[PDB]
C-alpha angles and dihedrals in degrees: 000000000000113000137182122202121189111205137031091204121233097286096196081057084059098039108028098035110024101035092225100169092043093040104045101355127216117122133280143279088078130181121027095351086052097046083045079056093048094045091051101046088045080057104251116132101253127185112183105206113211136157104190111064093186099075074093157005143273089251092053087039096054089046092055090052095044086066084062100248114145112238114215125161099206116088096194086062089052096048091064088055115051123078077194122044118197115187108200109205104138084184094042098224092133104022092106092034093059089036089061094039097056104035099080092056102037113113132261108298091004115160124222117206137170128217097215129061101274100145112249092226084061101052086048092052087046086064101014102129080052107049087042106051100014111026109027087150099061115096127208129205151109145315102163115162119220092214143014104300101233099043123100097236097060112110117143139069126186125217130201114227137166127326138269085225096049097264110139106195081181152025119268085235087049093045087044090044089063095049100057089048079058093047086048099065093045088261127138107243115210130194122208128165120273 
């Protein structure tokens, strides 16, 4: 599949102040370069959209684009590529912010879908004069890893799906269509309502 991810993660964050490799091993580069990585080498066309290069180095760089995953810093440019759009923000600051600036420019039936907890419910209010009258097609939910992406331990994601209440946030292709991105690198894929 085509997916966009928005966001590498600060990599020193990973590897100076959480220990990552000594805590729960793998092998950097770790977050939503990592899960860029994973996607590639699973053989889905992957570009990992991020403005800053310093989250990490040449070395981690070179790594990202040897998997095969495209590097742009423009988020507007990625938008236009992902059928799937993951926007990797593990504190949540930009994750609505992304979200307004893409949906306009995804293709025809994209999804948009955030790592961290964010309710879905949330993400949908945040656009939701957009995604009702201009972009009925485009379908929110959920790609939150259990654990760090990157580590070997980490072996769930959950997926937001419909709603206890009847409110579908996404179609059921669209749902199924993330759960099977989650079966493709080895992962176990979970479904819980929005």
């Amino acid at each position: 599949m085509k997916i966009s991810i928005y966001g590498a993660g600060n990599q020193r964050l990973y590897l100076e102040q959480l220990k990552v490799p000594e805590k729960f091993g793998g092998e950097p580069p770790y977050g939503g370069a990592g899960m860029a990585i994973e996607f590639a080498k699973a053989g889905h066309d992957v570009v990992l959209s991020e403005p800053n290069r310093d989250v990490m180095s040449d070395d981690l760089w070179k790594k990202v684009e040897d998997a095969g995953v495209k590097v742009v810093s423009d988020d507007i440019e990625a938008a236009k590529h992902g059928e799937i759009h993951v926007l990797f923000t593990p504190f949540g600051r930009i994750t609505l912010n992304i979200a307004n600036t893409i949906i306009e420019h995804v293709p025809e039936n994209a999804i948009i879908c955030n790592t961290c907890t964010i309710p879905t419910p949330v993400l949908y209010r945040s656009l939701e004069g957009i995604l009702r009258l201009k972009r009925r097609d485009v379908g929110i939910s959920s790609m939150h890893p259990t654990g760090v992406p990157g580590t070997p331990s980490q072996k769930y994601y959950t997926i937001a799906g419909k709603a206890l209440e009847g409110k579908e946030y996404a179609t059921e292709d669209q749902i199924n269509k993330l759960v099977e991105l989650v079966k493709s690198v080895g992962k176990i894929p979970y479904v819980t309502p929005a």
